[PDB]
Design a binder for this molecule. Structure first.
Ligand SMILES: Nc1ncnc2c1ncn2[C@@H]1O[C@H](COP(=O)(O)O)[C@@H](O)[C@H]1O
Ligand SMILES: Nc1ncnc2c1ncn2[C@@H]1O[C@H](COP(=O)(O)O)[C@@H](O)[C@H]1O
Ligand code: NA
Ligand code: NA
Lengths: 137, 137
């Protein structure tokens, strides 16, 4: 399950595969999207869910994911512009409330957050954790 | 500063250089250690502080850092065994209270933490942040 959610993850790399594998083992319905079919070898033997090969910077790829049914969308490619494209479409075309994007450039965080997209910026996250260990929290 | 601390950072890569540059701009005394002299090109023009070339898996390198004077030691190489060596020496040979290590393998976190070493494990940190965005926290 009654708690099962519909989750779309773009990017089946190091980050995306980790989240996909965990989401699947938690009982969610998971769609994982990558431009490179070989990326899917990171999904483990237990992964239940569906794969989609396509370039997520193309609207037609976004249409093939059933994103209007999604509870959450994760924009986890290695390109900030692509993740912005995915996340803006998720929010506004497909009306997804919970959208999380990876953002490498800290200066790009603001434009995502002003559009209601939650951000994971590795540099910021590491600095925040160091600060907690020095100054408290 | 009167607030200036003595900070030793091992590994001048992507993570270490970011912390070194920020520490220096905050007014701290910073020693940065790397086996590869070319790594120091990541330090910015404003960086004040000292560099040490050496293999941090060798005790003689650890002796050249004045670690018994350190307020904090950051074990930020790309090798978990090396970071354990550095951190254990920092804690117990050089009596540093505040020691932070990067740990890639989540299964290795426990042995660091049982020895009073704070850990930054990228995979764990990313999963924790995703969880906060879904479940709150
Ligand atoms: N335009 C795109 N559409 C879909 N997947 C992409 C796109 N650009 C990059 N990726 C994927 O994002 C992933 C990034 O991997 P990593 O840096 O390990 O998280 C790789 O598997 C890439 O093939
Ligand atoms: N045994 C070691 N002693 C000192 N520096 C090291 C050692 N092993 C790796 N490193 C450095 O740690 C850094 C890791 O870089 P990065 O993966 O970008 O954080 C590099 O600049 C390496 O040369
Ligand atoms: Na807007
Ligand atoms: Na011990």
């Amino acid at each position: 399950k009654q708690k099962s959610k519909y989750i779309v993850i773009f990017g089946c790399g190091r980050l995306g595969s980790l989240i996909a594998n965990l989401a699947s083992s938690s009982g969610h319905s998971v769609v994982v999207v990558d431009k490179n079919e070989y990326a899917f070898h990171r999904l483990n033997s237990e992964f239940s869910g569906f794969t989609v090969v396509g370039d997520a910077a193309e609207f037609e790829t976004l249409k093939e994911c059933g994103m209007e049914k999604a509870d959450m969308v994760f924009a986890f490619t290695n390109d900030d512009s692509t993740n912005f494209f995915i996340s803006m479409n998720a929010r506004y075309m497909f009306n997804v409330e919970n959208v999380i994007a990876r953002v490498y450039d800290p200066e790009k965080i603001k434009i995502f957050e002003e559009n209601g997209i939650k951000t994971i910026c590795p540099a910021v996250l590491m600095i925040e954790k160091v600060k907690e260990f020095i100054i408290g929290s």
